[PDB]
Tab-separated table of C-alpha atoms and ligand atoms in Angstrom:
chain	number	residue	atom	x	y	z
A	26	UNK	CA	98.607	49.320	76.686
A	27	UNK	CA	95.775	51.854	76.312
A	28	UNK	CA	94.479	53.824	79.355
A	29	UNK	CA	90.797	54.040	80.401
A	30	UNK	CA	88.906	56.319	77.947
A	31	UNK	CA	88.061	58.757	80.776
A	32	UNK	CA	91.760	59.391	81.372
A	33	UNK	CA	92.689	59.400	77.677
A	34	UNK	CA	90.347	62.396	77.288
A	35	UNK	CA	91.693	64.109	80.472
A	36	UNK	CA	95.296	63.478	79.214
A	37	UNK	CA	94.301	64.858	75.828
A	38	UNK	CA	92.892	68.010	77.436
A	39	UNK	CA	95.964	68.531	79.665
A	40	UNK	CA	98.372	68.168	76.738
A	41	UNK	CA	96.286	70.357	74.497
A	42	UNK	CA	96.014	73.263	76.974
A	43	UNK	CA	99.453	73.013	78.791
A	44	UNK	CA	101.726	72.308	75.799
A	45	UNK	CA	102.551	74.767	73.028
A	46	UNK	CA	102.669	74.545	69.212
A	47	UNK	CA	101.233	71.478	67.456
A	48	UNK	CA	99.655	70.285	70.677
A	49	UNK	CA	97.334	73.323	70.935
A	50	UNK	CA	95.675	72.474	67.633
A	51	UNK	CA	95.569	68.693	68.125
A	52	UNK	CA	92.330	66.792	67.561
A	53	UNK	CA	91.400	64.030	70.022
A	54	UNK	CA	91.505	61.338	67.316
A	55	UNK	CA	95.190	62.312	66.651
A	56	UNK	CA	96.260	61.934	70.344
A	57	UNK	CA	98.560	59.009	71.301
A	58	UNK	CA	98.827	57.766	74.872
A	59	UNK	CA	100.274	54.549	76.311
A	60	UNK	CA	100.720	53.286	79.846
A	61	UNK	CA	104.249	53.231	81.270
A	68	UNK	CA	100.880	55.934	87.403
A	69	UNK	CA	102.798	57.029	84.309
A	70	UNK	CA	101.808	57.571	80.642
A	71	UNK	CA	103.664	58.501	77.500
A	72	UNK	CA	101.720	61.097	75.519
A	73	UNK	CA	102.753	61.883	71.992
A	74	UNK	CA	102.080	63.671	68.764
A	75	UNK	CA	101.397	61.683	65.537
A	76	UNK	CA	104.600	61.019	63.588
A	77	UNK	CA	102.995	62.908	60.681
A	78	UNK	CA	102.354	66.135	62.678
A	79	UNK	CA	105.292	68.527	62.357
A	80	UNK	CA	106.436	70.545	65.334
A	81	UNK	CA	105.611	74.264	65.028
A	82	UNK	CA	108.377	75.475	67.323
A	83	UNK	CA	110.356	73.855	70.122
A	84	UNK	CA	107.527	71.934	71.786
A	85	UNK	CA	108.233	68.305	72.815
A	86	UNK	CA	106.966	65.554	70.446
A	87	UNK	CA	106.400	63.517	73.487
A	88	UNK	CA	105.886	63.835	77.218
A	89	UNK	CA	105.381	61.990	80.419
A	90	UNK	CA	102.117	62.275	82.246
A	91	UNK	CA	102.366	61.479	85.943
A	92	UNK	CA	99.076	61.038	87.825
A	93	UNK	CA	99.125	61.312	91.631
A	120	UNK	CA	101.766	71.001	102.422
A	121	UNK	CA	103.708	67.953	101.125
A	122	UNK	CA	102.154	68.464	97.666
A	123	UNK	CA	103.356	72.099	97.670
A	124	UNK	CA	106.883	71.054	98.650
A	125	UNK	CA	107.168	68.256	96.086
A	126	UNK	CA	105.943	70.548	93.300
A	127	UNK	CA	108.292	73.419	94.201
A	128	UNK	CA	111.237	71.009	94.464
A	129	UNK	CA	110.532	69.442	91.065
A	130	UNK	CA	110.150	72.860	89.421
A	131	UNK	CA	113.441	74.108	90.905
A	132	UNK	CA	115.431	70.971	89.926
A	133	UNK	CA	113.866	71.411	86.433
A	134	UNK	CA	115.013	75.038	86.233
A	135	UNK	CA	118.501	73.988	87.300
A	136	UNK	CA	118.680	71.126	84.750
A	137	UNK	CA	119.127	68.547	87.507
A	138	UNK	CA	115.765	66.881	86.828
A	139	UNK	CA	113.286	66.361	83.917
A	140	UNK	CA	111.735	69.561	82.560
A	141	UNK	CA	108.363	70.480	83.959
A	142	UNK	CA	105.733	71.320	81.260
A	143	UNK	CA	102.552	71.378	83.298
A	144	UNK	CA	101.202	71.216	86.836
A	145	UNK	CA	97.562	70.726	87.863
A	146	UNK	CA	95.594	69.131	90.781
A	147	UNK	CA	95.580	65.592	89.384
A	148	UNK	CA	99.259	65.461	88.285
A	149	UNK	CA	102.132	66.755	86.183
A	150	UNK	CA	103.465	66.744	82.574
A	151	UNK	CA	107.205	66.128	82.529
A	152	UNK	CA	109.953	65.776	80.009
A	153	UNK	CA	110.117	62.251	78.614
A	154	UNK	CA	113.701	61.031	78.954
A	155	UNK	CA	114.697	58.172	76.550
A	156	UNK	CA	116.521	55.848	78.923
A	157	UNK	CA	116.400	52.715	81.007
A	158	UNK	CA	116.937	52.098	84.712
A	159	UNK	CA	120.193	50.682	85.973
A	160	UNK	CA	120.359	47.112	87.268
A	161	UNK	CA	121.856	46.407	90.687
A	162	UNK	CA	125.049	44.850	89.222
A	163	UNK	CA	125.850	48.045	87.263
A	164	UNK	CA	126.257	50.103	90.447
A	165	UNK	CA	129.737	48.588	90.951
A	166	UNK	CA	130.961	49.335	87.398
A	167	UNK	CA	133.698	51.902	88.080
A	168	UNK	CA	132.513	54.454	85.490
A	169	UNK	CA	128.887	54.173	86.719
A	170	UNK	CA	129.893	54.484	90.348
A	171	UNK	CA	132.119	57.541	89.633
A	172	UNK	CA	129.255	59.213	87.777
A	173	UNK	CA	126.726	58.481	90.551
A	174	UNK	CA	129.177	60.028	93.013
A	175	UNK	CA	129.397	63.181	90.820
A	176	UNK	CA	125.621	63.417	90.313
A	177	UNK	CA	125.125	63.035	94.090
A	178	UNK	CA	127.784	65.654	94.893
A	179	UNK	CA	125.890	68.098	92.543
A	180	UNK	CA	122.574	67.298	94.159
A	181	UNK	CA	124.195	67.989	97.560
A	182	UNK	CA	125.287	71.491	96.356
A	183	UNK	CA	121.622	72.423	95.728
A	184	UNK	CA	120.178	75.180	97.932
A	185	UNK	CA	116.465	74.575	98.450
A	186	UNK	CA	113.752	76.621	100.267
A	187	UNK	CA	113.086	73.805	102.764
A	188	UNK	CA	113.776	73.240	106.459
A	189	UNK	CA	117.564	72.916	106.872
A	190	UNK	CA	117.308	71.074	110.270
A	191	UNK	CA	118.208	67.422	109.659
A	192	UNK	CA	115.206	65.943	111.410
A	193	UNK	CA	113.971	63.728	108.570
A	194	UNK	CA	116.212	60.688	109.497
A	195	UNK	CA	115.415	60.067	113.174
A	196	UNK	CA	112.046	61.749	112.790
A	197	UNK	CA	111.021	59.133	110.220
A	198	UNK	CA	112.644	56.269	112.183
A	199	UNK	CA	110.836	57.372	115.386
A	200	UNK	CA	107.529	57.613	113.511
A	201	UNK	CA	107.824	54.126	111.970
A	202	UNK	CA	108.962	52.512	115.276
A	203	UNK	CA	105.801	53.970	116.912
A	204	UNK	CA	103.731	52.153	114.236
A	205	UNK	CA	105.724	48.904	114.396
A	206	UNK	CA	105.268	48.604	118.190
A	207	UNK	CA	101.494	48.526	117.721
A	208	UNK	CA	101.239	46.306	114.657
A	209	UNK	CA	99.259	43.131	115.180
A	210	UNK	CA	99.368	40.630	112.351
A	211	UNK	CA	96.659	37.899	112.300
A	212	UNK	CA	98.531	35.597	109.886
A	213	UNK	CA	100.617	32.929	111.588
A	214	UNK	CA	103.803	33.530	109.626
A	215	UNK	CA	103.907	37.304	109.989
A	216	UNK	CA	103.177	37.165	113.756
A	217	UNK	CA	106.264	35.001	114.241
A	218	UNK	CA	108.405	37.229	111.973
A	219	UNK	CA	107.383	40.401	113.827
A	220	UNK	CA	108.085	38.726	117.206
A	221	UNK	CA	111.639	38.004	116.115
A	222	UNK	CA	112.211	41.590	114.871
A	223	UNK	CA	110.676	43.038	118.075
A	224	UNK	CA	112.885	40.794	120.279
A	225	UNK	CA	115.885	43.020	119.474
A	226	UNK	CA	114.417	45.856	121.616
A	227	UNK	CA	114.288	48.289	118.761
A	228	UNK	CA	113.672	51.446	120.875
A	229	UNK	CA	116.870	50.932	122.825
A	230	UNK	CA	118.788	49.988	119.648
A	231	UNK	CA	117.512	53.157	117.848
A	232	UNK	CA	118.963	55.220	120.733
A	233	UNK	CA	122.283	53.401	120.448
A	234	UNK	CA	122.294	54.285	116.749
A	235	UNK	CA	121.364	57.935	117.592
A	236	UNK	CA	124.312	58.134	119.931
A	237	UNK	CA	126.757	56.680	117.395
A	238	UNK	CA	125.559	59.057	114.670
A	239	UNK	CA	125.632	62.050	117.027
A	240	UNK	CA	129.327	61.441	117.611
A	241	UNK	CA	129.760	61.290	113.822
A	242	UNK	CA	130.327	64.568	111.925
A	243	UNK	CA	128.392	64.684	108.656
A	244	UNK	CA	127.341	67.875	106.880
A	245	UNK	CA	123.574	68.531	106.428
A	246	UNK	CA	122.915	68.908	102.688
A	247	UNK	CA	120.007	68.488	100.346
A	248	UNK	CA	119.797	64.704	99.962
A	249	UNK	CA	118.073	62.446	97.407
A	250	UNK	CA	117.515	59.799	100.212
A	251	UNK	CA	116.660	56.954	97.775
A	252	UNK	CA	119.572	56.631	95.386
A	253	UNK	CA	118.945	53.039	94.290
A	254	UNK	CA	119.427	51.617	90.778
A	255	UNK	CA	115.632	52.001	90.129
A	256	UNK	CA	115.968	55.804	90.401
A	257	UNK	CA	119.062	56.220	88.165
A	258	UNK	CA	118.384	56.528	84.404
A	259	UNK	CA	121.011	55.450	81.872
A	260	UNK	CA	120.520	57.927	79.029
A	261	UNK	CA	119.946	56.501	75.505
A	262	UNK	CA	122.882	57.100	73.110
A	263	UNK	CA	125.176	58.020	76.041
A	264	UNK	CA	126.016	54.390	77.120
A	265	UNK	CA	129.431	54.691	75.372
A	266	UNK	CA	130.305	57.937	77.213
A	267	UNK	CA	132.634	57.850	80.224
A	268	UNK	CA	131.037	60.603	82.275
A	269	UNK	CA	127.659	61.969	81.150
A	270	UNK	CA	125.284	59.056	80.849
A	271	UNK	CA	123.115	59.111	84.064
A	272	UNK	CA	120.277	61.138	85.526
A	273	UNK	CA	118.964	60.755	89.125
A	274	UNK	CA	115.134	60.781	89.317
A	275	UNK	CA	112.301	60.199	91.834
A	276	UNK	CA	112.561	62.842	94.558
A	277	UNK	CA	109.776	61.514	96.767
A	278	UNK	CA	112.076	61.263	99.809
A	279	UNK	CA	114.441	64.121	99.127
A	280	UNK	CA	115.111	66.444	102.110
A	281	UNK	CA	117.888	68.131	103.992
A	282	UNK	CA	119.734	65.290	105.764
A	283	UNK	CA	123.179	64.013	106.774
A	284	UNK	CA	125.318	63.566	103.695
A	285	UNK	CA	126.472	60.307	105.299
A	286	UNK	CA	122.972	58.916	104.977
A	287	UNK	CA	122.761	59.550	101.248
A	288	UNK	CA	126.087	57.858	100.434
A	289	UNK	CA	125.652	55.056	103.021
A	290	UNK	CA	122.136	54.351	101.695
A	291	UNK	CA	123.492	54.154	98.171
A	292	UNK	CA	126.277	51.678	99.252
A	293	UNK	CA	123.612	49.522	100.998
A	294	UNK	CA	121.665	49.337	97.748
A	295	UNK	CA	124.570	47.472	96.107
A	296	UNK	CA	123.283	44.509	98.202
A	297	UNK	CA	119.640	44.471	97.072
A	298	UNK	CA	118.192	43.357	93.776
A	299	UNK	CA	114.472	44.084	93.405
A	300	UNK	CA	113.932	42.591	89.904
A	301	UNK	CA	113.598	39.044	91.278
A	302	UNK	CA	110.365	37.766	89.701
A	303	UNK	CA	109.431	35.145	92.346
A	304	UNK	CA	108.624	35.628	96.109
A	305	UNK	CA	109.986	37.453	98.222
A	306	UNK	CA	110.630	39.576	95.023
A	307	UNK	CA	114.101	40.685	96.065
A	308	UNK	CA	117.503	39.107	96.629
A	309	UNK	CA	119.975	40.237	99.331
A	310	UNK	CA	123.701	39.557	99.177
A	311	UNK	CA	125.815	41.112	101.935
A	312	UNK	CA	128.942	40.152	100.017
A	313	UNK	CA	128.099	42.759	97.348
A	314	UNK	CA	128.429	45.726	99.722
A	315	UNK	CA	131.214	47.899	98.267
A	316	UNK	CA	134.725	47.078	99.529
A	317	UNK	CA	136.832	49.915	101.035
A	318	UNK	CA	138.595	50.095	97.695
A	319	UNK	CA	135.209	50.594	95.882
A	320	UNK	CA	134.144	53.114	98.543
A	321	UNK	CA	137.390	54.982	97.992
A	322	UNK	CA	136.797	55.030	94.252
A	323	UNK	CA	133.291	56.442	94.762
A	324	UNK	CA	134.363	59.157	97.236
A	325	UNK	CA	137.463	60.034	95.218
A	326	UNK	CA	134.901	61.089	92.538
A	327	UNK	CA	132.380	62.651	95.052
A	328	UNK	CA	134.871	64.894	96.811
A	329	UNK	CA	136.242	66.977	93.929
A	330	UNK	CA	132.699	67.265	92.529
A	331	UNK	CA	131.503	68.602	95.913
A	332	UNK	CA	134.634	70.729	96.690
A	333	UNK	CA	136.013	72.372	93.464
A	334	UNK	CA	139.744	72.402	94.477
A	335	UNK	CA	139.884	69.244	96.644
A	336	UNK	CA	142.570	67.853	94.300
A	337	UNK	CA	145.042	70.607	95.442
A	338	UNK	CA	145.354	69.411	99.052
A	339	UNK	CA	148.252	67.394	100.606
A	340	UNK	CA	147.946	63.619	99.909
A	341	UNK	CA	147.655	62.979	103.660
A	342	UNK	CA	144.975	65.689	104.005
A	343	UNK	CA	142.947	64.176	101.147
A	344	UNK	CA	143.762	60.808	102.858
A	345	UNK	CA	142.551	62.059	106.212
A	346	UNK	CA	139.352	63.546	104.701
A	347	UNK	CA	138.715	60.309	102.794
A	348	UNK	CA	139.350	58.132	105.876
A	349	UNK	CA	137.043	60.149	108.025
A	350	UNK	CA	134.308	60.191	105.326
A	351	UNK	CA	134.417	56.409	104.885
A	352	UNK	CA	133.961	55.970	108.666
A	353	UNK	CA	131.064	58.538	108.440
A	354	UNK	CA	129.313	56.795	105.508
A	355	UNK	CA	129.591	53.294	106.958
A	356	UNK	CA	128.108	54.429	110.264
A	357	UNK	CA	125.234	56.162	108.440
A	358	UNK	CA	124.673	53.074	106.307
A	359	UNK	CA	123.469	51.484	109.571
A	360	UNK	CA	120.648	54.100	109.550
A	361	UNK	CA	119.713	52.960	105.986
A	362	UNK	CA	119.139	49.433	107.333
A	363	UNK	CA	117.255	50.567	110.355
A	364	UNK	CA	115.029	53.030	108.544
A	365	UNK	CA	114.150	50.835	105.560
A	366	UNK	CA	113.781	47.835	107.845
A	367	UNK	CA	111.236	49.747	109.920
A	368	UNK	CA	109.542	51.090	106.759
A	369	UNK	CA	109.132	47.492	105.411
A	370	UNK	CA	107.393	46.220	108.585
A	371	UNK	CA	104.886	49.154	108.297
A	372	UNK	CA	104.377	48.317	104.623
A	373	UNK	CA	103.698	44.613	105.504
A	374	UNK	CA	100.729	45.855	107.481
A	375	UNK	CA	99.489	48.649	105.137
A	376	UNK	CA	100.757	47.906	101.589
A	377	UNK	CA	99.010	45.890	98.851
A	378	UNK	CA	102.017	45.721	96.497
A	379	UNK	CA	103.228	42.085	96.196
A	380	UNK	CA	106.601	41.964	97.950
A	381	UNK	CA	108.062	39.972	100.862
A	382	UNK	CA	108.120	42.975	103.208
A	383	UNK	CA	108.705	41.023	106.436
A	384	UNK	CA	111.509	39.064	104.847
A	385	UNK	CA	113.014	42.281	103.528
A	386	UNK	CA	112.811	43.846	107.000
A	387	UNK	CA	114.709	40.805	108.369
A	388	UNK	CA	117.385	41.106	105.654
A	389	UNK	CA	117.935	44.808	106.561
A	390	UNK	CA	118.116	44.101	110.275
A	391	UNK	CA	120.475	41.159	109.613
A	392	UNK	CA	122.763	43.587	107.706
A	393	UNK	CA	122.448	46.231	110.435
A	394	UNK	CA	123.785	43.814	113.067
A	395	UNK	CA	126.430	42.290	110.784
A	396	UNK	CA	127.827	45.726	109.914
A	397	UNK	CA	127.541	47.041	113.465
A	398	UNK	CA	129.762	44.031	114.424
A	399	UNK	CA	132.505	44.602	111.775
A	400	UNK	CA	132.576	48.321	112.687
A	401	UNK	CA	133.113	47.269	116.327
B	1	LIG	CL1	142.336	56.637	97.343
């Protein structure tokens, strides 16, 4: 798919002035761009590279803007994210990573899950120049609840759906969750906050490799937060498939939440990646750490339900993307109460 000519010529100008070598001398008629909002920009196959410039790039078109840009640049410097080739008011030129997204069902593959754990442990070792107070989680939940209390739907169906969600007394329930998570030690670390299959790239040519085949992307929500949240949110995503092509445009299956065995496999890979010499501790000390972490992560998974449930109600009101947001909200709240119950 070709972009609008206006943006083709803007994209041409950005690539020509921000990228080195063959790009600097490129004529407009030689420029290739296609829509992946995201575009692949590329040199002609018959133009040789002059040095080490990329033959192709990703063009992403868009206080918080400052923070997102600094974060992306730092993760790029550290080789945790795609390289950053250009930044400008309207967007960014990034490294194009040959890859595909993971599907929901691949998250449980033991090699995949072990790698995700390792990649997340590395992310959580990142020092960033951002507020270290973990106020994102309840701050965001409080902010969405405020909106949800005042939503009025006009459509018959949505009015009824909102009434049911509201009948739980969400303000009181949020405070119950706050109290549970307050009594629950979890280190504050730099979190991805959205580690779903959609944001994990499987790297082309590396599919046959045991350990180095993924990259985490999409740092929109990344902030300092309870480590429990990041892992618990990830576990929750085992239950949700968003590639369903008919309404509501997702499928939920509570039965696909990782078993304690699967959770143990994941954290047995997280822990030594986070703590270099974890493997030298007494079996019962590793056991104790693992037991206490699993209780931590499953309590914080309740916050994943609550937060994304609240987020989905707000989106029902304000979004124009086609997705069964009210139904999704109900699925998340259904899982919140189900898991609250099994936990006790
Ligand atoms: Cl174990």
